[PDB]
Amino acid sequence: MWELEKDVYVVEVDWTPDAPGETVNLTCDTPEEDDITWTSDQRHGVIGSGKTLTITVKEFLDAGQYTCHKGGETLSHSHLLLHKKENGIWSTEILKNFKNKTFLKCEAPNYSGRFTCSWLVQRNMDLKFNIKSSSSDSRAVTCGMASLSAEKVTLDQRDYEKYSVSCQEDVTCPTAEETLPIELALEARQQNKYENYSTSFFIRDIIKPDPPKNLQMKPLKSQVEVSWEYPDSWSTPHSYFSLKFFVRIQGCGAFLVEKTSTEVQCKGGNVCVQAQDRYYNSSCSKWACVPCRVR
Amino acid sequence: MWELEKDVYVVEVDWTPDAPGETVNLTCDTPEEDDITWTSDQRHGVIGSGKTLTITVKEFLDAGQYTCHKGGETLSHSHLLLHKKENGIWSTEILKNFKNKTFLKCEAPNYSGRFTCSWLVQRNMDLKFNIKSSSSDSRAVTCGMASLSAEKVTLDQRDYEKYSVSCQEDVTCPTAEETLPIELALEARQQNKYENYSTSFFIRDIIKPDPPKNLQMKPLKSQVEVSWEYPDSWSTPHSYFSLKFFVRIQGCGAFLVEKTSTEVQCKGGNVCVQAQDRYYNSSCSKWACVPCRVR
Ligand SMILES: *[C@@H]1O[C@H](CO)[C@@H](O[C@@H]2O[C@H](CO)[C@@H](O[C@@H]3O[C@H](CO[C@H]4O[C@H](CO)[C@@H](O)[C@H](O[C@H]5O[C@H](CO)[C@@H](O)[C@H](O)[C@@H]5O)[C@@H]4O)[C@@H](O)[C@H](O[C@H]4O[C@H](CO)[C@@H](O)[C@H](O)[C@@H]4O)[C@@H]3O)[C@H](O)[C@H]2NC(C)=O)[C@H](O)[C@H]1NC(C)=O
Ligand SMILES: *[C@@H]1O[C@H](CO)[C@@H](O[C@@H]2O[C@H](CO)[C@@H](O[C@@H]3O[C@H](CO[C@H]4O[C@H](CO)[C@@H](O)[C@H](O[C@H]5O[C@H](CO)[C@@H](O)[C@H](O)[C@@H]5O)[C@@H]4O)[C@@H](O)[C@H](O[C@H]4O[C@H](CO)[C@@H](O)[C@H](O)[C@@H]4O)[C@@H]3O)[C@H](O)[C@H]2NC(C)=O)[C@H](O)[C@H]1NC(C)=O
Ligand SMILES: [Cl-]
Ligand SMILES: [Cl-]
């Protein structure tokens, strides 16, 4: 057993059918040594005595908050969390991996050093999350607090609630090549179940620019000119942070164009265009569409 | 002759004792072709006629503003500047080089990409300055407007007025090694004299941190502890952007200490400390001093 925060301990337990639980000792933060009794918020009545309580922890009813008591007064408390281990493998039950069997998916709309990471939960109940830089050589990152998103991700015939966190690399270098990845670790808590997850990535690999903006269209000799602009969130200056665009007619039959304008032949329909980093093949934006109509 | 801005041209002239001036043609921005006369703000009365004025420019009285005139109305103007060339060498007369025979000295208190460049003038009269990135591969820089500083630099038995400009690298990388220098060009104008100057530097080489702050002192078994803190302007985090300090008793007999505190034996006097980048030998701060007295 090890301490996670003050008066909160993680007990690693093996859930193979009949495996012996862990014997843990809880000592009461008190000077007294006589008439000390213990209680648990998972059980009813005195379940132990003495200043040091020894118990066998194997199932979740053994976890929770253990409280001290002497002469009718409560003296101290301690909280136990279980980190499950089955078939020799840490449990991955709080989060549901994405389609590619990964648990944390992160995204950046530019090279600012800002990015958002997301994960899916199997049950949105009594959750506590904490994400931070795994190592601090390392690219230090500052992360906000996780938030529940209105967007439910559908997998199988599943609708999962999604949590996302936005972070910022403390000191950034948008231009130079990244030679060390950003390393993060997520701690997940559900009631008294403890899990943790990790990921490592380069910003250049998780790039996903916003869609082109102000997609206008003008008529010419039919032939039609479609033009757009770089999204406002994209890194500046555009001369260095240059993008490419795919234009089609209705990760990432649409043809490539490098300028912010291109000729085409629509005459009735919606014309859509996406963007991508010009010199690196990261992810492409969502489609920006506008009706194809002129006078 | 070449155009600097609209209706302002630079004429390169040789000032070797008796060298032939340059023949320049000034054409009047008018449809008319008859009864066109010319005047100069350096001379009195009509000094030319015709829609195209041909003149020999060798001295500064030949420069200035030439004005068109027809039937009593002024039609157009053109302004001439001279870029002096003597003994086969461009003139360096508006600015006075620093002690090391350079003209532009720049300084940065951190790796933010912000820095200030300064130069000295021989005569603070009718001056116009403009500084910009020489090439725009290149580290683009945005510069404010030059300003006269109260600090007069004394050289020889000289007291020179100093001009300084503050600029910012548009996109910075404080951590990675600089492999290309920042290249700037200063244009200097004094009345109708034109000159320009250039410099190239790495930020790491022009680093000059601010002095240590809150230099406190406490007594111990005599022996005295002096402690300080990193300046607020220094790059963060200090764990990466680490400094060293020299401590002495009263570019950069004072001994080195790496922590922000050190023991010493003063008992009466001022104790001074300076700072320097820990892993690179740039310039050292100005001394931060405080009286050495305790109770
Ligand atoms: C993701 O999840 C994994 C799995 O849960 C995490 O791995 C665990 O991390 C913790 C914290 O880093 C590790 O804890 C440490 O364990 C060492 C070694 O302990 C041993 O030797 C001691 C010798 O005296 C002995 O007393 C210890 O006994 C206790 O534990 C055993 C079971 O391990 C139990 O049977 C006994 O009854 C005791 O209860 C033990 O045998 C320990 O030395 C560490 O503690 C010192 O240092 C820390 C940090 O300075 C300090 O806080 C302590 O107070 C103490 O001073 C610490 O407890 C644990 O071993 C990891 N588990 C595994 C399997 O490796 C992982 O960290 C998570 N990652 C992220 C990013 O969240
Ligand atoms: C620092 O200071 C130095 C010295 O002053 C600067 O160097 C000068 O920079 C300017 C601007 O870049 C240079 O000007 C250019 O000159 C070329 C070549 O001109 C020649 O060939 C022409 C062929 O038709 C000919 O007509 C020209 O004739 C004129 O000039 C000669 C004297 O040179 C004169 O005798 C004639 O009577 C004419 O008046 C000339 O022989 C020219 O082609 C350039 O112009 C075109 O392109 C520019 C930019 O697109 C455009 O603005 C023009 O309208 C034109 O379309 C331009 O005029 C000059 O040559 C440099 N001097 C030297 C010695 O190299 C330097 O730039 C400064 N640096 C900084 C950072 O400030
Ligand atoms: Cl990822
Ligand atoms: Cl310099």
PDB file of N, CA and C in Angstrom, chain B residues 53-131:
ATOM      1  N   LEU B  53      13.748  67.957 -65.701  1.00  0.00           N
ATOM      2  CA  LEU B  53      14.867  68.765 -65.235  1.00  0.00           C
ATOM      3  C   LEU B  53      16.107  67.891 -65.109  1.00  0.00           C
ATOM      4  N   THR B  54      17.184  68.303 -65.770  1.00  0.00           N
ATOM      5  CA  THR B  54      18.470  67.623 -65.703  1.00  0.00           C
ATOM      6  C   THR B  54      19.445  68.496 -64.925  1.00  0.00           C
ATOM      7  N   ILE B  55      20.110  67.903 -63.932  1.00  0.00           N
ATOM      8  CA  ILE B  55      21.003  68.634 -63.045  1.00  0.00           C
ATOM      9  C   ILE B  55      22.179  67.744 -62.670  1.00  0.00           C
ATOM     10  N   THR B  56      23.256  68.386 -62.225  1.00  0.00           N
ATOM     11  CA  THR B  56      24.430  67.700 -61.705  1.00  0.00           C
ATOM     12  C   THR B  56      24.422  67.827 -60.187  1.00  0.00           C
ATOM     13  N   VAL B  57      24.370  66.692 -59.499  1.00  0.00           N
ATOM     14  CA  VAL B  57      24.272  66.646 -58.045  1.00  0.00           C
ATOM     15  C   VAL B  57      25.612  66.177 -57.497  1.00  0.00           C
ATOM     16  N   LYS B  58      26.270  67.037 -56.719  1.00  0.00           N
ATOM     17  CA  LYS B  58      27.553  66.683 -56.124  1.00  0.00           C
ATOM     18  C   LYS B  58      27.619  67.088 -54.656  1.00  0.00           C
ATOM     19  N   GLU B  59      26.964  68.186 -54.293  1.00  0.00           N
ATOM     20  CA  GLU B  59      27.006  68.704 -52.934  1.00  0.00           C
ATOM     21  C   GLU B  59      25.592  68.846 -52.386  1.00  0.00           C
ATOM     22  N   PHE B  60      25.513  69.101 -51.078  1.00  0.00           N
ATOM     23  CA  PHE B  60      24.227  69.056 -50.393  1.00  0.00           C
ATOM     24  C   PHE B  60      23.314  70.203 -50.806  1.00  0.00           C
ATOM     25  N   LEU B  61      23.877  71.327 -51.251  1.00  0.00           N
ATOM     26  CA  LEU B  61      23.037  72.397 -51.771  1.00  0.00           C
ATOM     27  C   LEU B  61      22.288  71.963 -53.025  1.00  0.00           C
ATOM     28  N   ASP B  62      22.777  70.935 -53.722  1.00  0.00           N
ATOM     29  CA  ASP B  62      22.067  70.377 -54.865  1.00  0.00           C
ATOM     30  C   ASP B  62      20.921  69.461 -54.458  1.00  0.00           C
ATOM     31  N   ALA B  63      20.872  69.029 -53.201  1.00  0.00           N
ATOM     32  CA  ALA B  63      19.826  68.134 -52.737  1.00  0.00           C
ATOM     33  C   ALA B  63      18.656  68.958 -52.199  1.00  0.00           C
ATOM     34  N   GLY B  64      17.743  68.306 -51.492  1.00  0.00           N
ATOM     35  CA  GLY B  64      16.559  68.960 -50.980  1.00  0.00           C
ATOM     36  C   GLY B  64      15.330  68.659 -51.813  1.00  0.00           C
ATOM     37  N   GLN B  65      14.346  69.546 -51.700  1.00  0.00           N
ATOM     38  CA  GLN B  65      13.081  69.397 -52.407  1.00  0.00           C
ATOM     39  C   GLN B  65      13.083  70.269 -53.656  1.00  0.00           C
ATOM     40  N   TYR B  66      12.874  69.644 -54.811  1.00  0.00           N
ATOM     41  CA  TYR B  66      12.666  70.349 -56.069  1.00  0.00           C
ATOM     42  C   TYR B  66      11.170  70.404 -56.350  1.00  0.00           C
ATOM     43  N   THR B  67      10.677  71.579 -56.731  1.00  0.00           N
ATOM     44  CA  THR B  67       9.250  71.789 -56.923  1.00  0.00           C
ATOM     45  C   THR B  67       8.959  72.239 -58.348  1.00  0.00           C
ATOM     46  N   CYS B  68       7.825  71.761 -58.864  1.00  0.00           N
ATOM     47  CA  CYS B  68       7.323  72.124 -60.182  1.00  0.00           C
ATOM     48  C   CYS B  68       6.512  73.407 -60.121  1.00  0.00           C
ATOM     49  N   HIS B  69       6.424  74.099 -61.254  1.00  0.00           N
ATOM     50  CA  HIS B  69       5.636  75.324 -61.313  1.00  0.00           C
ATOM     51  C   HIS B  69       5.253  75.579 -62.762  1.00  0.00           C
ATOM     52  N   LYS B  70       3.992  75.943 -62.974  1.00  0.00           N
ATOM     53  CA  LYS B  70       3.511  76.371 -64.280  1.00  0.00           C
ATOM     54  C   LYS B  70       2.439  77.430 -64.072  1.00  0.00           C
ATOM     55  N   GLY B  71       2.593  78.563 -64.749  1.00  0.00           N
ATOM     56  CA  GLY B  71       1.608  79.624 -64.669  1.00  0.00           C
ATOM     57  C   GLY B  71       1.306  80.100 -63.267  1.00  0.00           C
ATOM     58  N   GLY B  72       2.221  79.885 -62.324  1.00  0.00           N
ATOM     59  CA  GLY B  72       2.041  80.318 -60.957  1.00  0.00           C
ATOM     60  C   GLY B  72       1.519  79.252 -60.016  1.00  0.00           C
ATOM     61  N   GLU B  73       1.173  78.072 -60.523  1.00  0.00           N
ATOM     62  CA  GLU B  73       0.700  76.972 -59.692  1.00  0.00           C
ATOM     63  C   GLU B  73       1.809  75.942 -59.519  1.00  0.00           C
ATOM     64  N   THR B  74       1.875  75.343 -58.333  1.00  0.00           N
ATOM     65  CA  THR B  74       2.833  74.282 -58.051  1.00  0.00           C
ATOM     66  C   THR B  74       2.209  72.942 -58.419  1.00  0.00           C
ATOM     67  N   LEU B  75       2.909  72.176 -59.251  1.00  0.00           N
ATOM     68  CA  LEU B  75       2.348  70.982 -59.870  1.00  0.00           C
ATOM     69  C   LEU B  75       2.745  69.690 -59.170  1.00  0.00           C
ATOM     70  N   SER B  76       3.996  69.573 -58.736  1.00  0.00           N
ATOM     71  CA  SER B  76       4.516  68.323 -58.197  1.00  0.00           C
ATOM     72  C   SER B  76       5.825  68.623 -57.480  1.00  0.00           C
ATOM     73  N   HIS B  77       6.290  67.650 -56.700  1.00  0.00           N
ATOM     74  CA  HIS B  77       7.508  67.803 -55.921  1.00  0.00           C
ATOM     75  C   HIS B  77       8.323  66.519 -55.991  1.00  0.00           C
ATOM     76  N   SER B  78       9.619  66.656 -55.718  1.00  0.00           N
ATOM     77  CA  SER B  78      10.520  65.519 -55.580  1.00  0.00           C
ATOM     78  C   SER B  78      11.623  65.912 -54.611  1.00  0.00           C
ATOM     79  N   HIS B  79      12.044  64.958 -53.785  1.00  0.00           N
ATOM     80  CA  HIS B  79      13.030  65.194 -52.741  1.00  0.00           C
ATOM     81  C   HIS B  79      14.246  64.311 -52.973  1.00  0.00           C
ATOM     82  N   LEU B  80      15.430  64.897 -52.821  1.00  0.00           N
ATOM     83  CA  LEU B  80      16.687  64.206 -53.064  1.00  0.00           C
ATOM     84  C   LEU B  80      17.474  64.071 -51.769  1.00  0.00           C
ATOM     85  N   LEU B  81      18.017  62.879 -51.544  1.00  0.00           N
ATOM     86  CA  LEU B  81      18.926  62.614 -50.441  1.00  0.00           C
ATOM     87  C   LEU B  81      20.259  62.144 -51.003  1.00  0.00           C
ATOM     88  N   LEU B  82      21.335  62.465 -50.294  1.00  0.00           N
ATOM     89  CA  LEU B  82      22.681  62.095 -50.705  1.00  0.00           C
ATOM     90  C   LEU B  82      23.201  60.992 -49.795  1.00  0.00           C
ATOM     91  N   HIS B  83      23.752  59.943 -50.397  1.00  0.00           N
ATOM     92  CA  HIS B  83      24.473  58.900 -49.677  1.00  0.00           C
ATOM     93  C   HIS B  83      25.948  59.070 -50.018  1.00  0.00           C
ATOM     94  N   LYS B  84      26.718  59.589 -49.066  1.00  0.00           N
ATOM     95  CA  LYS B  84      28.085  60.009 -49.334  1.00  0.00           C
ATOM     96  C   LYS B  84      29.022  58.815 -49.467  1.00  0.00           C
ATOM     97  N   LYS B  85      30.005  58.964 -50.353  1.00  0.00           N
ATOM     98  CA  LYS B  85      31.001  57.935 -50.627  1.00  0.00           C
ATOM     99  C   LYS B  85      32.341  58.629 -50.813  1.00  0.00           C
ATOM    100  N   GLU B  86      33.287  58.354 -49.919  1.00  0.00           N
ATOM    101  CA  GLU B  86      34.589  59.005 -49.935  1.00  0.00           C
ATOM    102  C   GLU B  86      35.687  57.960 -49.816  1.00  0.00           C
ATOM    103  N   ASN B  87      36.733  58.115 -50.628  1.00  0.00           N
ATOM    104  CA  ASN B  87      37.846  57.168 -50.660  1.00  0.00           C
ATOM    105  C   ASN B  87      37.362  55.749 -50.938  1.00  0.00           C
ATOM    106  N   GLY B  88      36.247  55.626 -51.653  1.00  0.00           N
ATOM    107  CA  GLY B  88      35.679  54.327 -51.941  1.00  0.00           C
ATOM    108  C   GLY B  88      34.960  53.682 -50.782  1.00  0.00           C
ATOM    109  N   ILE B  89      34.488  54.468 -49.816  1.00  0.00           N
ATOM    110  CA  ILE B  89      33.899  53.947 -48.587  1.00  0.00           C
ATOM    111  C   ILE B  89      32.644  54.746 -48.263  1.00  0.00           C
ATOM    112  N   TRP B  90      31.564  54.045 -47.920  1.00  0.00           N
ATOM    113  CA  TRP B  90      30.342  54.719 -47.502  1.00  0.00           C
ATOM    114  C   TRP B  90      30.591  55.498 -46.216  1.00  0.00           C
ATOM    115  N   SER B  91      29.967  56.666 -46.110  1.00  0.00           N
ATOM    116  CA  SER B  91      30.193  57.543 -44.971  1.00  0.00           C
ATOM    117  C   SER B  91      29.434  57.052 -43.744  1.00  0.00           C
ATOM    118  N   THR B  92      30.087  57.143 -42.590  1.00  0.00           N
ATOM    119  CA  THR B  92      29.508  56.785 -41.296  1.00  0.00           C
ATOM    120  C   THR B  92      29.613  57.999 -40.375  1.00  0.00           C
ATOM    121  N   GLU B  93      28.804  59.026 -40.654  1.00  0.00           N
ATOM    122  CA  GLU B  93      28.913  60.304 -39.967  1.00  0.00           C
ATOM    123  C   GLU B  93      27.712  60.648 -39.096  1.00  0.00           C
ATOM    124  N   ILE B  94      26.547  60.046 -39.339  1.00  0.00           N
ATOM    125  CA  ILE B  94      25.391  60.321 -38.490  1.00  0.00           C
ATOM    126  C   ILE B  94      25.556  59.648 -37.133  1.00  0.00           C
ATOM    127  N   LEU B  95      26.076  58.427 -37.119  1.00  0.00           N
ATOM    128  CA  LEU B  95      26.267  57.662 -35.898  1.00  0.00           C
ATOM    129  C   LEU B  95      27.743  57.637 -35.523  1.00  0.00           C
ATOM    130  N   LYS B  96      28.007  57.523 -34.224  1.00  0.00           N
ATOM    131  CA  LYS B  96      29.359  57.376 -33.700  1.00  0.00           C
ATOM    132  C   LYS B  96      29.494  55.987 -33.092  1.00  0.00           C
ATOM    133  N   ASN B  97      30.428  55.200 -33.619  1.00  0.00           N
ATOM    134  CA  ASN B  97      30.584  53.820 -33.182  1.00  0.00           C
ATOM    135  C   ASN B  97      30.957  53.752 -31.705  1.00  0.00           C
ATOM    136  N   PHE B  98      30.555  52.658 -31.063  1.00  0.00           N
ATOM    137  CA  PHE B  98      30.876  52.437 -29.663  1.00  0.00           C
ATOM    138  C   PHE B  98      32.367  52.127 -29.512  1.00  0.00           C
ATOM    139  N   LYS B  99      32.781  51.876 -28.268  1.00  0.00           N
ATOM    140  CA  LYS B  99      34.201  51.713 -27.973  1.00  0.00           C
ATOM    141  C   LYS B  99      34.846  50.630 -28.830  1.00  0.00           C
ATOM    142  N   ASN B 100      34.068  49.648 -29.288  1.00  0.00           N
ATOM    143  CA  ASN B 100      34.597  48.540 -30.072  1.00  0.00           C
ATOM    144  C   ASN B 100      34.454  48.763 -31.575  1.00  0.00           C
ATOM    145  N   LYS B 101      34.193  49.998 -31.999  1.00  0.00           N
ATOM    146  CA  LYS B 101      34.085  50.366 -33.407  1.00  0.00           C
ATOM    147  C   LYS B 101      32.861  49.761 -34.087  1.00  0.00           C
ATOM    148  N   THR B 102      31.886  49.298 -33.311  1.00  0.00           N
ATOM    149  CA  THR B 102      30.577  48.920 -33.821  1.00  0.00           C
ATOM    150  C   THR B 102      29.601  50.069 -33.595  1.00  0.00           C
ATOM    151  N   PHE B 103      28.524  50.075 -34.377  1.00  0.00           N
ATOM    152  CA  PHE B 103      27.555  51.162 -34.326  1.00  0.00           C
ATOM    153  C   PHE B 103      26.253  50.797 -33.631  1.00  0.00           C
ATOM    154  N   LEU B 104      25.834  49.536 -33.686  1.00  0.00           N
ATOM    155  CA  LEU B 104      24.596  49.092 -33.059  1.00  0.00           C
ATOM    156  C   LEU B 104      24.931  48.096 -31.958  1.00  0.00           C
ATOM    157  N   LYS B 105      24.520  48.410 -30.732  1.00  0.00           N
ATOM    158  CA  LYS B 105      24.666  47.516 -29.591  1.00  0.00           C
ATOM    159  C   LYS B 105      23.281  47.132 -29.093  1.00  0.00           C
ATOM    160  N   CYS B 106      23.025  45.830 -28.998  1.00  0.00           N
ATOM    161  CA  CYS B 106      21.727  45.314 -28.593  1.00  0.00           C
ATOM    162  C   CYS B 106      21.857  44.490 -27.320  1.00  0.00           C
ATOM    163  N   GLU B 107      20.740  44.373 -26.606  1.00  0.00           N
ATOM    164  CA  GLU B 107      20.727  43.772 -25.281  1.00  0.00           C
ATOM    165  C   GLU B 107      19.382  43.103 -25.042  1.00  0.00           C
ATOM    166  N   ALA B 108      19.407  41.967 -24.345  1.00  0.00           N
ATOM    167  CA  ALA B 108      18.199  41.223 -24.018  1.00  0.00           C
ATOM    168  C   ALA B 108      18.257  40.797 -22.554  1.00  0.00           C
ATOM    169  N   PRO B 109      17.221  41.080 -21.759  1.00  0.00           N
ATOM    170  CA  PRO B 109      17.228  40.655 -20.354  1.00  0.00           C
ATOM    171  C   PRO B 109      16.746  39.231 -20.130  1.00  0.00           C
ATOM    172  N   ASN B 110      16.388  38.509 -21.181  1.00  0.00           N
ATOM    173  CA  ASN B 110      15.917  37.131 -21.078  1.00  0.00           C
ATOM    174  C   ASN B 110      15.888  36.550 -22.488  1.00  0.00           C
ATOM    175  N   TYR B 111      15.358  35.332 -22.617  1.00  0.00           N
ATOM    176  CA  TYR B 111      15.226  34.660 -23.902  1.00  0.00           C
ATOM    177  C   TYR B 111      13.830  34.817 -24.497  1.00  0.00           C
ATOM    178  N   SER B 112      13.084  35.835 -24.064  1.00  0.00           N
ATOM    179  CA  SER B 112      11.724  36.036 -24.551  1.00  0.00           C
ATOM    180  C   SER B 112      11.664  36.267 -26.053  1.00  0.00           C
ATOM    181  N   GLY B 113      12.778  36.639 -26.676  1.00  0.00           N
ATOM    182  CA  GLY B 113      12.763  37.170 -28.019  1.00  0.00           C
ATOM    183  C   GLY B 113      12.676  38.678 -28.082  1.00  0.00           C
ATOM    184  N   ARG B 114      12.404  39.333 -26.956  1.00  0.00           N
ATOM    185  CA  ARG B 114      12.432  40.784 -26.877  1.00  0.00           C
ATOM    186  C   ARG B 114      13.857  41.258 -26.623  1.00  0.00           C
ATOM    187  N   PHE B 115      14.216  42.379 -27.243  1.00  0.00           N
ATOM    188  CA  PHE B 115      15.524  42.982 -27.036  1.00  0.00           C
ATOM    189  C   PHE B 115      15.448  44.448 -27.431  1.00  0.00           C
ATOM    190  N   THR B 116      16.446  45.207 -26.994  1.00  0.00           N
ATOM    191  CA  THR B 116      16.579  46.615 -27.337  1.00  0.00           C
ATOM    192  C   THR B 116      17.936  46.842 -27.987  1.00  0.00           C
ATOM    193  N   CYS B 117      17.946  47.618 -29.069  1.00  0.00           N
ATOM    194  CA  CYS B 117      19.170  48.011 -29.752  1.00  0.00           C
ATOM    195  C   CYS B 117      19.356  49.516 -29.619  1.00  0.00           C
ATOM    196  N   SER B 118      20.609  49.945 -29.485  1.00  0.00           N
ATOM    197  CA  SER B 118      20.927  51.345 -29.257  1.00  0.00           C
ATOM    198  C   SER B 118      22.063  51.782 -30.172  1.00  0.00           C
ATOM    199  N   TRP B 119      22.111  53.089 -30.424  1.00  0.00           N
ATOM    200  CA  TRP B 119      23.192  53.702 -31.183  1.00  0.00           C
ATOM    201  C   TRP B 119      23.368  55.133 -30.697  1.00  0.00           C
ATOM    202  N   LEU B 120      24.504  55.726 -31.050  1.00  0.00           N
ATOM    203  CA  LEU B 120      24.843  57.081 -30.639  1.00  0.00           C
ATOM    204  C   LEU B 120      24.879  58.000 -31.852  1.00  0.00           C
ATOM    205  N   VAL B 121      24.454  59.245 -31.654  1.00  0.00           N
ATOM    206  CA  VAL B 121      24.432  60.246 -32.712  1.00  0.00           C
ATOM    207  C   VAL B 121      25.488  61.301 -32.416  1.00  0.00           C
ATOM    208  N   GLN B 122      26.092  61.826 -33.483  1.00  0.00           N
ATOM    209  CA  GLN B 122      27.075  62.892 -33.335  1.00  0.00           C
ATOM    210  C   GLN B 122      26.410  64.253 -33.172  1.00  0.00           C
ATOM    211  N   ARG B 123      25.246  64.451 -33.787  1.00  0.00           N
ATOM    212  CA  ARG B 123      24.492  65.694 -33.668  1.00  0.00           C
ATOM    213  C   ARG B 123      23.013  65.345 -33.628  1.00  0.00           C
ATOM    214  N   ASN B 124      22.354  65.675 -32.518  1.00  0.00           N
ATOM    215  CA  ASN B 124      20.944  65.334 -32.319  1.00  0.00           C
ATOM    216  C   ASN B 124      20.065  66.430 -32.922  1.00  0.00           C
ATOM    217  N   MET B 125      20.038  66.455 -34.254  1.00  0.00           N
ATOM    218  CA  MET B 125      19.314  67.489 -34.981  1.00  0.00           C
ATOM    219  C   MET B 125      18.754  66.917 -36.275  1.00  0.00           C
ATOM    220  N   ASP B 126      17.454  67.116 -36.486  1.00  0.00           N
ATOM    221  CA  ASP B 126      16.774  66.745 -37.725  1.00  0.00           C
ATOM    222  C   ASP B 126      17.103  65.307 -38.125  1.00  0.00           C
ATOM    223  N   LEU B 127      16.749  64.379 -37.243  1.00  0.00           N
ATOM    224  CA  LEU B 127      17.054  62.970 -37.429  1.00  0.00           C
ATOM    225  C   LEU B 127      15.784  62.180 -37.713  1.00  0.00           C
ATOM    226  N   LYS B 128      15.914  61.167 -38.567  1.00  0.00           N
ATOM    227  CA  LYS B 128      14.857  60.197 -38.821  1.00  0.00           C
ATOM    228  C   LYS B 128      15.498  58.821 -38.898  1.00  0.00           C
ATOM    229  N   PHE B 129      15.013  57.889 -38.082  1.00  0.00           N
ATOM    230  CA  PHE B 129      15.554  56.541 -38.030  1.00  0.00           C
ATOM    231  C   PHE B 129      14.481  55.529 -38.409  1.00  0.00           C
ATOM    232  N   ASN B 130      14.930  54.386 -38.920  1.00  0.00           N
ATOM    233  CA  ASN B 130      14.039  53.274 -39.238  1.00  0.00           C
ATOM    234  C   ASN B 130      14.856  51.995 -39.182  1.00  0.00           C
ATOM    235  N   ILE B 131      14.418  51.041 -38.366  1.00  0.00           N
ATOM    236  CA  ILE B 131      15.120  49.778 -38.187  1.00  0.00           C
ATOM    237  C   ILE B 131      14.141  48.641 -38.434  1.00  0.00           C
TER     238      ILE B 131
END
